[PDB]
Amino acid sequence: MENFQKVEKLGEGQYGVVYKARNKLTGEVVALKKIRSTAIREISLLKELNHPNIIKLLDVIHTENKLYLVFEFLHQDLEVFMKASALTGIPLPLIKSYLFQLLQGLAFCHSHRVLHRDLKPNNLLINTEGAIKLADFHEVVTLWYRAPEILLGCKYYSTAVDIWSLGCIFAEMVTRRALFPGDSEIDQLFRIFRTLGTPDEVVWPGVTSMPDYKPSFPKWARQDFSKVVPPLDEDGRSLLSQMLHYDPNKRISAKAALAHPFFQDVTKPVPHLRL
Numbered sequence: 479m480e481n482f483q484k485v486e487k488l489g490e491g492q493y494g495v496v497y498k499a500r501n502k503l504t505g506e507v508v509a510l511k512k513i514r515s516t517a518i519r520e521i522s523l524l525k526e527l528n529h530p531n532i533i534k535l536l537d538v539i540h541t542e543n544k545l546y547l548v549f550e551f552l553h554q555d556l557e558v559f560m561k562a563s564a565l566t567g568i569p570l571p572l573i574k575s576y577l578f579q580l581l582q583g584l585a586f587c588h589s590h591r592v593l594h595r596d597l598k599p600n601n602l603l604i605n606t607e608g609a610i611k612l613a614d615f616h617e618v619v620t621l622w623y624r625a626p627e628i629l630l631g632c633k634y635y636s637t638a639v640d641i642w643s644l645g646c647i648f649a650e651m652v653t654r655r656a657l658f659p660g661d662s663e664i665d666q667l668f669r670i671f672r673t674l675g676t677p678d679e680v681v682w683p684g685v686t687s688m689p690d691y692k693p694s695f696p697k698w699a700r701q702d703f704s705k706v707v708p709p710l711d712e713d714g715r716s717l718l719s720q721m722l723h724y725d726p727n728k729r730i731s732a733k734a735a736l737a738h739p740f741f742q743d744v745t746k747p748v749p750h751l752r753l
């Protein structure tokens with residue numbers, strides 16, 4: 479830490495605390511994550527995962543029990559920007575741009591057999607140029623973006639978990655309200671079931687044999703989908719429904735979603751950021 483002037487705590491990541499910091503020699507402003515053997519080798523592969531829509535990992539330093547990860551610093555997160563934009567909403571062309579960019583990032587991750595696993599507005603980072611990046615591959619766990627197969631005890635996540643999370647974020651950008659704001663795993667699951675219908679073997683083969691599936695779950699009927707994201711046009715609703723299929727095998731892939739008609743008129747607008 480003698481090599482960095484700390485400036486400000488930014489918050490808690492998945493495995494430790496993040497500081498904005500300045501490199502003493504270069505003047506570079508970076509985000510430094512402080513963590514607390516096979517992870518040393520695995521995070522080194524994460525340094526080679528370079529794409530415009532993925533946060534740049536600049537350095538991995540292992541020393542005195544702790545691991546420091548030095549990342550690119552970005553000026554705001556999407557959670558903050560959505561709160562700042564809640565009176566009027568984020569304009570639809572900017573929603574569309576951010577969704578398209580995140581799908582490019584995920585298509586890249588997934589083609590390199592990297593999953594995110596915990597996508598949420600606060601690990602999506604934005605800049606003044608209109609880019610958005612995937613990041614963070616006594617705090618209370620947020621379950622609102624959790625795919626149903628995770629909540630039902632699937633041991634082997636697939637890439638589809640990230641498409642589900644991104645679908646929940648898409649919905650929240652458009653409606654200005656979180657799609658499934660549960661405060662426990664069972665409340666999260668029942669919020670999903672009340673909106674999308676309690677899944678059965680017709681819509682999700684194998685659902686009843688999942689570790690945490692109980693025959694005794696309530697049987698709610700699927701809500702009408704025009705009721706769930708009203709301001710979204712039918713192309714947006716179609717895409718969303720494909721991102722929120724219960725069966726991960728049915729759920730659209732990032733690569734397939736990029737070809738969806740919702741993106742025919744996609745553009746790259748400038749956000750209004752107050753920094």
Ligand SMILES: CC(C)c1cnn2c(NCc3ccccc3)cc(NC[C@H]3CCNC[C@@H]3O)nc12
Nearest residue numbers: 488489496509549551552553554600601613614
């Ligand atoms: C560690 C790396 C991924 C990183 C780069 N920029 N940046 C910003 N920037 C936005 C910002 C700027 C100024 C004040 C607050 C937030 C915030 C931030 N927050 C810390 C956690 C919060 C929970 N989600 C994961 C984040 O890395 N982590 C990062």
